[PDB]
Amino acid sequence: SDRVRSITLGNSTITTQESANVVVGYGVWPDYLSDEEATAEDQPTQPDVATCRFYTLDSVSWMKESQGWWWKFPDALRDMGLFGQNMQYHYLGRSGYTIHVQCNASKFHQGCLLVVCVPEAEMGAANINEKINREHLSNGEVANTFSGTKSSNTNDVQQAVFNAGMGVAVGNLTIFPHQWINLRTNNCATIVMPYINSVPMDNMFRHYNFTLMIIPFAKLDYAAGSSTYIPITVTVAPMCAEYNGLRLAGHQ
Amino acid sequence: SDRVRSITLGNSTITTQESANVVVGYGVWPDYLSDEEATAEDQPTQPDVATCRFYTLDSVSWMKESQGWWWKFPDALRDMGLFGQNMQYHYLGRSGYTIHVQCNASKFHQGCLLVVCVPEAEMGAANINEKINREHLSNGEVANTFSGTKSSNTNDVQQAVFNAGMGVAVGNLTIFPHQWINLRTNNCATIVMPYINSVPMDNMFRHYNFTLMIIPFAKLDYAAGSSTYIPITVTVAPMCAEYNGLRLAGHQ
Amino acid sequence: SDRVRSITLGNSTITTQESANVVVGYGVWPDYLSDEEATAEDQPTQPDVATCRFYTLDSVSWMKESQGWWWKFPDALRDMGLFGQNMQYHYLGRSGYTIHVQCNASKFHQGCLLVVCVPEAEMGAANINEKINREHLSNGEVANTFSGTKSSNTNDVQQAVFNAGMGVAVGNLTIFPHQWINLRTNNCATIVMPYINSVPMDNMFRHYNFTLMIIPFAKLDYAAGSSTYIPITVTVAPMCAEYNGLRLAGHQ
Amino acid sequence: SKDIYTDAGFITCWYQTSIVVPAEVQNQSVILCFVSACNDFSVRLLRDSPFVRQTAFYQ
Amino acid sequence: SKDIYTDAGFITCWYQTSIVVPAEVQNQSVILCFVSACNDFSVRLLRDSPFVRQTAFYQ
């Protein structure tokens, strides 16, 4: 059967028995920068399997009235070992990513998730002509949470699920590489993003590459007696990462 | 897997994901009348895909103490569009049929149905030496209902499940083309009847070709909390239909 | 699918639809004694299919606080027809065995069984320097039951589950040919024992060849409303049996 | 746009039997609908969208 | 045995999401752990076991 999938990277392994199908990107597999498109001149550091491995983010609890979560991935992987350190000592960096989102339930549960990778998700502010603080955009490994009604916290992102922060219809977000975690039949939110930017290498702290979003369209709903605590765990692995421009320790 | 089946006729399509196996007839597939067995002399009307398509009959509700249902198919398809109109303007007609009976439940339900196509099911009257009205035999798209005890309505069919109306043992009705809708494992009550008569073409109103029967042997039974309303929908498509002897509008 | 298995011996047949995999022995299939390793001189009796067939032992009820069961198989098959009679008239005997242990539940149940065949399971006494009665070791077709705490019945086996009667750690019993009856996914406790002894043929009454044990590690546990009575049935068939040294009726 | 010469039809959905659930399973569920185009879909006349609206310059 | 020059590491297990069950199904379940060796496992120095203990002869 094709419901079984094993993913091996570095020294970590994820096995799923109720997978559906692994999505890979816009058709492109991640690969190192060729020397016909390169700009920087010194020798890049393709480190080892020391960074190309799975890192586990924190878990969020999916309740009956939860709305959505998001992360910022060149910034969310800032303290995960040698990826975080090679981020903090280099000026340029470049990497693809393999995101594996877990969530499980029983056969008596119902509910549906949407897992999108949105490149260049430029968030909008809550009050209109006002600056946004860096903590309200990206909180490291900690997820920021959408709301149902419009929000008006000062220096905060406008966080309504029916606009997804950017200002589009949320039913139109299926144009990006995505899957669905239907609790009837899925656990395989696997999305192999290639590197997507308009420069061949870029800074990790100053630029956010993309944004993972987990938006439940058909809400979690269960009968009385089932397990009410259903966690969601996001696991992410960088792929084909390389670094360039070594200098002293960066901006924490 | 062979649990999946798609049936395409005309401009209608039925997909099933928990089918078991499609039965086809007495081994014979429906086909147009050859000109070595034909009797009428003028050119027949094989109309189009305009009649060879699926038509949906009304739904009956299967309760805990329901007994059985029956239909009369050259008469039950009398108002389903162009099949009904070509019935009403022609003298002779001839058609096979593809009957698809739906019923679904959950895995916590139990109960078993029997779906038979009975050719020439000559019904018996309730009081013995008395005429039968046409409305008690065939009620169009509306199912007539058996009973558990013997019935004594005037000008009505003797409707006991342990005799099936005709006067035989109901456990012997598995000699006709049949399947079982076991709610554990079925939804595929598909039976492809060929044309069975002792004349090569016949009248649609004056003669009833066969009788569908849905008799639950192992009754529907469920625990408290499950969905109590379980409908049964019968879908029927004529196949290889042709018509002959055009005259004015018939008997409604 | 390989979840289906049919086993035919003599005039008996066991079909399973949720099997996992049939284990066969230490790699050896049962076979008759060759005449290069034989010791006795007269012609052996390989009877018929009259003994190589499945015999059903009694059923034990698996409760929430049950601990374990055991049997003694050249003695447990002492009254099962012609196997028992050919045991009672012959001096030597020799046979392999095919043991099939049944247990079923629903998908809402949980619990795990361990099914081991332990050769030469020399049991220990409850009080230390005291004889053991034959009824406390082997009770025919009736299972003897371990306990949770240490036992002190006079002339009885020391029956604690955490020592399995012999005096070893019970988690080390997976060195013998074994399977698990996980109620999530199994019913196939099938173990094809070859003949294991240090003499080419042996007496059936004086020597016990091996000991079946059913020890639940993860206990049976269910929610309120499910069927509380879960039986366990053990079926055993001798294979390649032959007998030698005919004399008068033996010791009952 | 809407004119009477090029009306296009209707999309309806009907219960065929029912929803049948066992005990202690929620009855009320949710169907999601998608839409897309085939490999023979085509558009012809550039016009401006009736949804863009601007009153003054954005500064 | 235990010495500080050849410490070997740690084995931990962490909830990744949760256990999610439907209604009228028991929440509290049981995981069983096994252990074995690979096809490159090797041992070297015969010594006596630290678990065998005898005080007088067994008679």
Coordinates of N, CA and C in Angstrom, one line a residue, chain A residues 16-160:
Chain A
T16 N 5.2 7.4 8.8 CA 3.8 7.6 8.9 C 3.1 6.4 8.3
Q17 N 2.0 5.9 8.9 CA 1.2 4.8 8.4 C -0.1 5.2 7.8
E18 N -0.5 6.5 8.0 CA -1.7 7.0 7.3 C -1.4 8.2 6.5
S19 N -0.3 8.1 5.7 CA 0.0 9.2 4.8 C -0.9 9.1 3.6
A20 N -1.1 10.1 2.8 CA -1.8 10.1 1.5 C -0.9 10.3 0.3
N21 N -0.2 11.4 0.2 CA 0.8 11.6 -0.9 C 1.7 12.8 -0.5
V22 N 3.0 12.6 -0.7 CA 3.9 13.7 -0.5 C 3.9 14.6 -1.7
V23 N 3.7 15.9 -1.4 CA 3.8 17.0 -2.3 C 5.2 17.4 -2.3
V24 N 5.7 17.8 -3.5 CA 7.1 18.4 -3.6 C 6.9 19.6 -4.5
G25 N 6.9 20.8 -3.8 CA 7.1 22.1 -4.4 C 6.3 22.5 -5.6
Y26 N 6.9 23.5 -6.3 CA 6.4 23.9 -7.7 C 7.0 22.9 -8.7
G27 N 7.2 21.7 -8.5 CA 7.8 20.8 -9.4 C 9.4 20.7 -9.3
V28 N 9.9 21.6 -8.5 CA 11.4 21.7 -8.3 C 11.8 21.1 -7.0
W29 N 12.8 20.3 -7.0 CA 13.5 19.7 -5.9 C 14.7 20.6 -5.4
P30 N 14.9 20.7 -4.1 CA 16.0 21.6 -3.7 C 17.4 21.2 -4.0
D31 N 18.2 22.1 -4.4 CA 19.5 21.8 -4.9 C 20.5 23.0 -4.6
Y32 N 21.8 22.7 -4.6 CA 22.7 23.7 -4.3 C 22.9 24.7 -5.4
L33 N 23.4 25.9 -5.1 CA 23.5 27.0 -6.1 C 24.6 26.6 -7.1
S34 N 24.3 26.7 -8.4 CA 25.3 26.5 -9.4 C 26.2 27.7 -9.5
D35 N 27.4 27.5 -10.1 CA 28.3 28.5 -10.2 C 28.2 29.3 -11.5
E36 N 27.0 29.1 -12.2 CA 26.7 30.0 -13.3 C 25.6 31.1 -12.9
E37 N 25.0 30.9 -11.7 CA 24.0 31.8 -11.2 C 24.5 32.5 -9.9
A38 N 25.8 32.2 -9.5 CA 26.3 32.7 -8.2 C 26.8 34.1 -8.3
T39 N 26.7 34.8 -7.2 CA 27.2 36.2 -7.1 C 28.4 36.3 -6.2
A40 N 28.3 35.8 -5.0 CA 29.4 35.9 -4.1 C 30.6 35.0 -4.6
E41 N 31.8 35.4 -4.1 CA 33.1 34.9 -4.7 C 33.8 33.9 -3.8
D42 N 33.7 34.0 -2.5 CA 34.4 33.0 -1.7 C 33.7 31.7 -1.6
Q43 N 34.4 30.7 -1.0 CA 34.0 29.3 -1.0 C 32.8 29.2 0.0
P44 N 31.7 28.7 -0.5 CA 30.5 28.5 0.4 C 30.8 27.3 1.4
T45 N 30.0 27.3 2.4 CA 30.1 26.3 3.5 C 28.8 25.4 3.3
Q46 N 29.0 24.3 2.6 CA 27.9 23.3 2.7 C 28.3 22.4 3.9
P47 N 27.7 22.6 5.1 CA 28.3 22.1 6.3 C 28.4 20.6 6.4
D48 N 27.3 19.9 6.5 CA 27.3 18.5 6.7 C 25.8 18.0 6.6
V49 N 25.5 16.8 7.1 CA 24.2 16.5 7.6 C 23.9 17.1 9.0
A50 N 24.8 18.0 9.5 CA 24.6 18.6 10.8 C 23.5 19.6 10.8
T51 N 23.1 20.2 9.7 CA 21.9 21.0 9.6 C 20.8 20.4 8.8
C52 N 21.0 19.5 7.9 CA 20.0 18.9 7.1 C 19.4 17.8 7.8
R53 N 18.5 18.1 8.8 CA 17.9 17.1 9.7 C 16.6 17.7 10.2
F54 N 15.7 16.9 10.8 CA 14.5 17.3 11.3 C 14.6 17.9 12.7
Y55 N 13.9 19.1 12.8 CA 13.8 19.8 14.1 C 12.4 19.9 14.5
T56 N 12.1 19.7 15.7 CA 10.7 19.7 16.2 C 10.3 21.0 16.8
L57 N 9.3 21.7 16.3 CA 8.8 22.9 16.9 C 7.9 22.6 18.1
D58 N 7.4 23.7 18.7 CA 6.5 23.4 19.8 C 5.1 23.0 19.3
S59 N 4.3 22.4 20.2 CA 3.0 21.9 19.8 C 1.9 22.9 20.2
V60 N 0.9 23.1 19.4 CA -0.3 23.9 19.7 C -1.4 22.9 19.9
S61 N -2.3 23.4 20.8 CA -3.5 22.6 21.1 C -4.7 23.0 20.3
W62 N -5.3 22.1 19.6 CA -6.4 22.4 18.7 C -7.7 22.2 19.4
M63 N -8.4 23.3 19.8 CA -9.6 23.2 20.5 C -10.8 23.4 19.6
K64 N -12.0 23.4 20.2 CA -13.2 23.6 19.3 C -13.3 24.9 18.7
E65 N -12.8 26.0 19.3 CA -13.0 27.3 18.8 C -11.6 28.0 18.5
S66 N -10.6 27.2 18.2 CA -9.4 27.7 17.7 C -9.5 28.2 16.2
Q67 N -8.7 29.1 15.8 CA -8.9 29.8 14.5 C -7.7 29.5 13.6
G68 N -6.5 29.5 14.0 CA -5.4 29.4 13.1 C -4.0 29.7 13.8
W69 N -3.0 29.3 13.1 CA -1.6 29.5 13.6 C -0.7 29.9 12.5
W70 N 0.4 30.6 12.8 CA 1.4 30.8 11.7 C 2.8 30.8 12.3
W71 N 3.8 30.5 11.4 CA 5.2 30.6 11.8 C 6.0 31.3 10.7
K72 N 7.2 31.6 10.9 CA 8.1 32.3 10.0 C 9.4 31.6 9.9
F73 N 9.7 30.8 8.9 CA 10.7 29.8 9.0 C 12.2 30.0 9.0
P74 N 12.7 31.0 8.2 CA 14.1 31.3 8.4 C 14.4 31.9 9.8
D75 N 13.3 32.5 10.4 CA 13.4 33.0 11.8 C 13.0 32.0 12.8
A76 N 12.1 31.0 12.5 CA 11.6 30.1 13.5 C 12.7 29.1 13.8
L77 N 13.6 28.7 12.8 CA 14.7 27.9 13.1 C 15.9 28.7 13.5
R78 N 15.8 29.5 14.5 CA 17.0 30.3 14.9 C 17.7 29.8 16.1
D79 N 17.2 28.8 16.8 CA 17.8 28.3 18.0 C 17.9 26.8 18.0
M80 N 17.7 26.2 16.8 CA 17.8 24.7 16.7 C 19.2 24.3 16.3
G81 N 20.1 24.4 17.3 CA 21.4 23.9 17.1 C 22.2 24.6 16.0
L82 N 22.9 23.8 15.2 CA 23.9 24.3 14.3 C 23.3 25.0 13.1
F83 N 22.0 24.8 12.8 CA 21.3 25.7 11.9 C 21.2 27.1 12.4
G84 N 20.9 27.2 13.7 CA 20.8 28.5 14.3 C 22.2 29.1 14.5
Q85 N 23.2 28.3 14.7 CA 24.6 28.9 14.9 C 25.1 29.4 13.5
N86 N 24.9 28.6 12.5 CA 25.4 29.0 11.1 C 24.6 30.1 10.6
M87 N 23.3 30.3 11.1 CA 22.6 31.5 10.8 C 23.3 32.7 11.6
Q88 N 23.8 32.5 12.8 CA 24.3 33.6 13.5 C 25.7 34.0 13.2
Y89 N 26.5 33.2 12.5 CA 27.8 33.6 12.1 C 28.0 34.0 10.7
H90 N 27.0 33.7 9.8 CA 27.1 34.0 8.4 C 26.3 35.1 8.0
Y91 N 26.7 35.8 6.9 CA 25.9 36.9 6.4 C 24.8 36.5 5.4
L92 N 25.2 35.5 4.5 CA 24.2 35.0 3.5 C 23.9 33.6 3.9
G93 N 22.7 33.1 3.4 CA 22.3 31.8 3.6 C 21.3 31.4 2.5
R94 N 21.1 30.1 2.4 CA 20.2 29.6 1.3 C 19.8 28.2 1.6
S95 N 18.5 27.9 1.6 CA 18.1 26.5 2.0 C 16.7 26.3 1.5
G96 N 16.4 25.0 1.1 CA 15.1 24.5 0.9 C 14.6 23.9 2.2
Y97 N 13.4 23.5 2.3 CA 12.8 23.0 3.5 C 11.8 21.8 3.3
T98 N 11.8 20.8 4.2 CA 10.8 19.8 4.2 C 10.0 19.8 5.5
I99 N 8.8 20.3 5.3 CA 7.9 20.5 6.5 C 7.0 19.3 6.7
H100 N 6.9 18.7 7.9 CA 6.1 17.6 8.1 C 5.2 17.9 9.4
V101 N 3.9 18.1 9.1 CA 3.0 18.5 10.2 C 2.2 17.3 10.7
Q102 N 2.3 17.0 12.0 CA 1.6 15.9 12.5 C 0.3 16.4 13.2
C103 N -0.7 15.5 13.2 CA -1.9 15.6 14.0 C -2.6 14.3 13.9
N104 N -3.1 13.8 15.0 CA -3.8 12.5 14.9 C -5.1 12.6 15.8
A105 N -6.0 11.7 15.4 CA -7.2 11.6 16.2 C -7.7 10.1 16.0
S106 N -8.9 9.8 16.5 CA -9.5 8.5 16.3 C -10.5 8.6 15.1
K107 N -11.1 7.5 14.8 CA -12.1 7.5 13.7 C -13.4 8.1 14.0
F108 N -13.7 8.4 15.3 CA -14.9 9.0 15.8 C -14.8 10.5 15.8
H109 N -13.6 11.1 15.4 CA -13.5 12.5 15.4 C -13.7 13.1 14.0
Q110 N -13.9 14.4 13.9 CA -14.1 15.0 12.6 C -13.5 16.4 12.7
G111 N -13.1 16.9 11.5 CA -12.4 18.2 11.4 C -11.4 18.1 10.3
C112 N -11.1 19.3 9.7 CA -10.2 19.4 8.6 C -9.3 20.6 8.7
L113 N -8.0 20.4 8.4 CA -7.0 21.4 8.5 C -6.5 21.8 7.1
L114 N -6.0 23.0 6.9 CA -5.4 23.4 5.7 C -4.0 23.8 6.0
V115 N -3.0 23.2 5.3 CA -1.6 23.5 5.6 C -1.0 24.1 4.3
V116 N -0.7 25.4 4.4 CA -0.1 26.1 3.2 C 1.2 26.6 3.6
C117 N 2.1 26.7 2.6 CA 3.4 27.4 2.7 C 3.2 28.7 1.8
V118 N 3.2 29.8 2.4 CA 2.9 31.1 1.6 C 4.2 31.9 1.5
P119 N 4.8 32.0 0.3 CA 6.0 32.8 0.1 C 5.7 34.3 0.2
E120 N 6.5 35.0 1.0 CA 6.5 36.4 1.1 C 5.2 37.0 1.6
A121 N 4.7 36.3 2.7 CA 3.4 36.7 3.3 C 3.6 38.0 4.1
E122 N 3.4 39.1 3.4 CA 3.6 40.4 4.0 C 2.4 40.7 4.9
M123 N 2.5 40.7 6.2 CA 1.4 40.8 7.1 C 0.9 42.3 7.2
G124 N -0.4 42.5 7.5 CA -0.9 43.8 7.6 C -1.1 44.2 9.1
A125 N -1.1 45.4 9.4 CA -1.2 45.9 10.8 C -2.6 46.0 11.2
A126 N -2.8 46.0 12.6 CA -4.2 46.0 13.1 C -4.8 47.3 13.0
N127 N -4.3 48.3 13.7 CA -4.6 49.7 13.4 C -3.7 50.1 12.2
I128 N -4.3 50.9 11.3 CA -3.9 50.9 9.9 C -2.5 51.6 9.7
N129 N -2.4 52.9 10.1 CA -1.1 53.6 9.8 C -0.2 53.6 11.0
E130 N 0.3 52.4 11.3 CA 1.0 52.2 12.6 C 2.0 51.0 12.3
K131 N 3.2 51.2 13.0 CA 4.3 50.2 12.8 C 3.9 48.9 13.4
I132 N 4.6 47.8 13.0 CA 4.4 46.5 13.5 C 5.7 46.1 14.3
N133 N 5.5 45.5 15.5 CA 6.7 45.0 16.2 C 7.1 43.7 15.7
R134 N 8.4 43.4 15.9 CA 8.9 42.1 15.4 C 8.4 40.9 16.1
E135 N 8.0 41.1 17.4 CA 7.5 40.0 18.2 C 6.2 39.5 17.8
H136 N 5.4 40.4 17.2 CA 4.0 40.1 16.8 C 4.0 39.4 15.4
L137 N 5.1 39.6 14.6 CA 5.2 38.8 13.4 C 5.7 37.4 13.6
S138 N 6.9 37.3 14.2 CA 7.6 36.1 14.4 C 8.0 35.9 15.8
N139 N 7.5 34.9 16.5 CA 7.8 34.6 17.9 C 8.7 33.4 18.1
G140 N 9.6 33.2 17.2 CA 10.6 32.1 17.3 C 9.9 30.8 16.9
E141 N 10.0 29.8 17.9 CA 9.3 28.5 17.7 C 7.9 28.6 18.2
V142 N 7.4 29.7 18.6 CA 6.1 29.8 19.2 C 5.1 30.4 18.2
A143 N 3.9 29.7 18.1 CA 3.0 30.1 17.0 C 2.2 31.3 17.4
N144 N 1.9 32.2 16.5 CA 1.0 33.3 16.7 C -0.3 32.9 16.2
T145 N -1.4 33.5 16.8 CA -2.7 32.9 16.6 C -3.6 34.0 16.0
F146 N -4.3 33.6 14.9 CA -5.3 34.4 14.3 C -6.5 34.5 15.2
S147 N -7.5 35.4 14.8 CA -8.7 35.5 15.6 C -9.9 35.3 14.6
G148 N -11.1 35.4 15.2 CA -12.3 35.3 14.4 C -12.8 36.7 14.0
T149 N -12.9 37.5 15.0 CA -13.3 38.9 14.8 C -12.0 39.7 14.5
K150 N -12.2 40.9 14.0 CA -11.0 41.8 13.8 C -10.4 42.2 15.1
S151 N -9.1 42.4 15.1 CA -8.3 42.7 16.3 C -7.8 44.1 16.2
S152 N -7.6 44.7 17.4 CA -7.1 46.1 17.5 C -6.1 46.3 18.6
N153 N -5.2 45.3 18.8 CA -4.1 45.5 19.7 C -3.1 46.4 19.0
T154 N -2.5 47.3 19.8 CA -1.5 48.2 19.3 C -0.2 47.5 18.9
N155 N 0.3 47.9 17.7 CA 1.5 47.4 17.1 C 1.4 45.9 16.9
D156 N 0.2 45.5 16.4 CA -0.1 44.0 16.2 C -0.5 43.8 14.8
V157 N -0.5 42.6 14.4 CA -1.0 42.2 13.0 C -2.5 42.1 13.1
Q158 N -3.1 42.6 12.0 CA -4.6 42.4 11.8 C -4.8 40.9 11.6
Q159 N -5.4 40.2 12.6 CA -5.5 38.8 12.6 C -6.9 38.3 12.5
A160 N -7.5 38.3 11.3 CA -8.8 37.7 11.1 C -8.6 36.5 10.1

